[PDB]
Symmetry: C6
Subunit: 71 residues, 6 copies
Amino acid sequence: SKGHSLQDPYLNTLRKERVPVSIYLVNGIKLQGQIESFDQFVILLKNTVSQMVYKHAISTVVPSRPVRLPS
Amino acid sequence: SLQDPYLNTLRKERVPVSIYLVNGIKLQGQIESFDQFVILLKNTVSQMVYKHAISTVVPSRPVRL
Amino acid sequence: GHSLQDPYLNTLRKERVPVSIYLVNGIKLQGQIESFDQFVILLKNTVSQMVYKHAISTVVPSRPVRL
Amino acid sequence: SLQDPYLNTLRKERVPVSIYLVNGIKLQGQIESFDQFVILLKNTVSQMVYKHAISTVVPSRPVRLPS
Amino acid sequence: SKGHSLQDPYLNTLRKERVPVSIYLVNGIKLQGQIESFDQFVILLKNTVSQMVYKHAISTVVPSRPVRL
Amino acid sequence: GHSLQDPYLNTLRKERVPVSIYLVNGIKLQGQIESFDQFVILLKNTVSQMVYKHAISTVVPSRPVRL
Ligand SMILES: Nc1ncnc2c1ncn2[C@@H]1O[C@H](COP(=O)(O)OP(=O)(O)NP(=O)(O)O)[C@@H](O)[C@H]1O
Ligand SMILES: Nc1ncnc2c1ncn2[C@@H]1O[C@H](COP(=O)(O)OP(=O)(O)NP(=O)(O)O)[C@@H](O)[C@H]1O
Ligand SMILES: Nc1ncnc2c1ncn2[C@@H]1O[C@H](COP(=O)(O)OP(=O)(O)NP(=O)(O)O)[C@@H](O)[C@H]1O
Ligand SMILES: Nc1ncnc2c1ncn2[C@@H]1O[C@H](COP(=O)(O)OP(=O)(O)O)[C@@H](O)[C@H]1O
Ligand SMILES: Nc1ncnc2c1ncn2[C@@H]1O[C@H](COP(=O)(O)OP(=O)(O)O)[C@@H](O)[C@H]1O
Ligand SMILES: Nc1ncnc2c1ncn2[C@@H]1O[C@H](COP(=O)(O)OP(=O)(O)O)[C@@H](O)[C@H]1O
Ligand SMILES: Nc1ncnc2[nH]cnc12
């Protein structure tokens, strides 16, 4: 329940398995696509182009299917 | 010091919570896990919620410390 | 940054002063400060809900408070 | 090194101010006290305003600016 | 570029030159004036009275005319 | 860390790629990235302007960047 011991494995699994996600922004806008990569502050989401979403503007990330969770 | 043992308890006892977001949206479910920056909330699929986007975590029944 | 914040919150906590917490989205929560740390405040009423400080705009006691 | 002396000037001279919050709310009163994260705004009661919720501090009259 | 290596010079230039700016806040509100001074966390915006603006509440700083670093 | 944000922004800059920058309040800005630091981006064209990153939600390149 500490560090990034949750967020990183999670995003990585989404990326590795190319799971389609919805990313809801803090203003309620919804983005959809696949996680191409990410770092400590941003997530790169694919579709028409690969856009760079700032984590500070994201509220939730909702995978289109259940997925392995971090250990 | 308060946040962790608190979230810990909600997770452990599997108490259904309402998570209200900074824009007013209400999310509902059970807390599977959480780390320093995010909380994993469980329903149909488990979704990842950034804490910076949360205003309040409201348990649907009272708990202790 | 907790040289005014902490004693202020602790005073509200020890004396159980009824307070309103207003959120950045305008939701007004009412109750009392059960407890707090560096990042959240635990506000009591029906249940005790955990409030993220980053989401708070103001804390408004129902009555004036010493310090 | 600028924020501090400014706020302190508003405090010492008891200048009436409007504080606009990031959501557009306008609070009025005077700066009673402050630390790194919050401002104690006095009027009906003295409430605690988190600095992160604030967009601007606007004095009702021109005031000495920090040199 | 690292750190404040763009923000400080850019602001410090708008300051020195007394260029009229529009400052948009995260809520869509537009302030206008001249940058009197600034530090790590706030900008003092000068007009009828100077006002102290928290950088955290600002989205964009738009000069009234082109400026050169 | 910045192992992605920085090379991404620098590639946009060096290659003069047109971007649309969407702010947290839903307003969309367009132009080329002239410069950037850890905290702000300088956007240029029909109007030159300094953008705080904390107020940005997405940077959408008008064509794909290749690391
Ligand atoms: N100190 C505050 N912090 C954040 N929001 C406030 C505050 N005071 C008032 N508001 C909001 O702005 C609205 C207008 O307030 P107002 O009509 O002047 O009455 P008030 O005594 O200042 N607060 P209230 O007792 O809740 O009505 C209120 O209804 C609140 O929603
Ligand atoms: N030493 C300081 N001097 C002046 N302002 C500060 C200082 N430290 C933090 N702040 C402000 O207070 C906020 C930082 O507190 P923080 O614990 O990060 O909550 P927050 O994330 O800013 N709340 P929010 O922006 O609504 O998500 C920022 O807005 C800062 O601008
Ligand atoms: N210095 C400021 N900082 C943040 N918001 C402001 C500021 N000045 C005005 N506003 C906002 O702008 C709107 C109203 O301002 P405006 O129409 O320009 O005149 P006014 O503020 O109503 N005049 P007054 O309130 O009597 O000083 C409100 O939404 C305010 O929140
Ligand atoms: N998991 C979520 N995270 C953030 N916002 C959400 C989430 N689910 C729904 N919303 C928002 O809640 C609001 C209500 O719409 P809603 O009826 O829930 O749509 P839907 O049923 O397709 O999810 C919408 O604005 C939507 O963006
Ligand atoms: N360069 C900019 N930076 C940030 N916000 C902007 C910018 N230009 C326009 N806006 C915002 O767009 C919003 C739309 O308001 P509006 O009444 O249509 O005037 P305008 O079309 O000039 O923007 C405004 O609230 C303003 O905040
Ligand atoms: N890639 C994005 N990142 C952040 N916000 C976006 C993005 N794309 C669209 N939006 C938001 O969605 C809203 C409108 O969506 P959009 O369909 O693109 O507009 P339009 O209907 O004019 O084509 C805008 O207010 C904008 O803020
Ligand atoms: N954010 C919120 N919105 C509505 N009711 C609430 N009760 C506790 N927190 C709440």
